[model samples]
Target: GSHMEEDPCECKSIVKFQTKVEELINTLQQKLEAVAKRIEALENKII
Candidate 1:
């Protein structure tokens, strides 16, 4: 579910870019999980 654009130059290696992307995805996944938990709580309490 992730697409990484090719680097424009050899300065940024694919492995480095992939590592950065994976870190970002992990952060985003945590945020999404927190939001989902909040959404479920709100629905249960108010809706």
Candidate 2:
């Protein structure tokens, strides 16, 4: 008789980095502004 079993996977190391929430919010705001401008330009060209 033979049996097969699965083993769990393990990683060597885990690391994390943290940043200010305000910084993320500011970045998001800037990105949104850029995207909005691009969309507006595209719309203007269509007319």
Q: Which candidate ranks first by TM-score, i.e. highest?
A: 1
Each model's C-alpha lDDT?
0.87, 0.66
lDDT of 2: 0.66
Highest lDDT, which number? 1
Deviation of model 2 at 18, angstroms: 9.5
- Which residue pairs overlap in candidate 1's backbone? none
Q: Mark the regions of model 2 whose C-alpha exceeds 4 Å error after superposition.
A: 1-19
- Backbone clash count, each prediction separately: 0, 0
RMSD of candidate 1 to the truth, in angstroms, is: 8.3
lDDT by residue for model 2 over 8-33, one digit each (tens)? Answer: 33132121122455578789999999
User: After TM-score superposition, what is the CA distance of residue 35 in candidate 2 from its true location, in Å?
Assistant: 0.6
